[PDB]
Amino acid sequence: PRAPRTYSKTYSTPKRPYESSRLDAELKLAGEFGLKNKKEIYRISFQLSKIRRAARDLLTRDEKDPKRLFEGNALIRRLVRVGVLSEDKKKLDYVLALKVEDFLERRLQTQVYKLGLAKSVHHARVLITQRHIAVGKQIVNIPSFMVRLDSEKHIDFAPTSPFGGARPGRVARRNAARKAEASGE
């Protein structure tokens, strides 16, 4: 006796799970990009398959079709704004040739690692998870943030997050107290 709220599954377990080629391919993916488990790869593959289905359906349509023009321009603009497609690759033949590594590169973990100040993808993962990242001026702690192209230059430490000053954290206070009450006198 109310309106149902919509929900969907974001991943899909493969029918052929433990074949060796996809197994060590996704092992390489989860190792180079520092992924926690295989649901990240399945989720990115689900998004890529949805984009591929949309691009195929649009490419079967005739040229200068207003439906094809509108949805193709919207999809290409969205993927350019995300940061997947290059600025000189705005064609449907090029979005049919995309890969999951483009989407895995764009996430916040790599995009804070690639800009420095993290020195490894797992230190970046821990830094994000421990409530440190400031995108723009808003604190982000989600490692799959998928940083926008226009927002790539605003990533820095928080006004909180003691690596950006403002009253160092708890174990530093513990160490200062121990050095004051025991080593101090």
Binding site: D24, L27, K28, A30, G31, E32, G34, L35, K36, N37, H122, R125
Partner: peptide, 14 residues
Amino acid sequence: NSRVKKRKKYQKAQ
């Protein structure tokens, strides 16, 4: 933690 296990698995692989 699955992340550290897959880290050292990929590290032995490389």
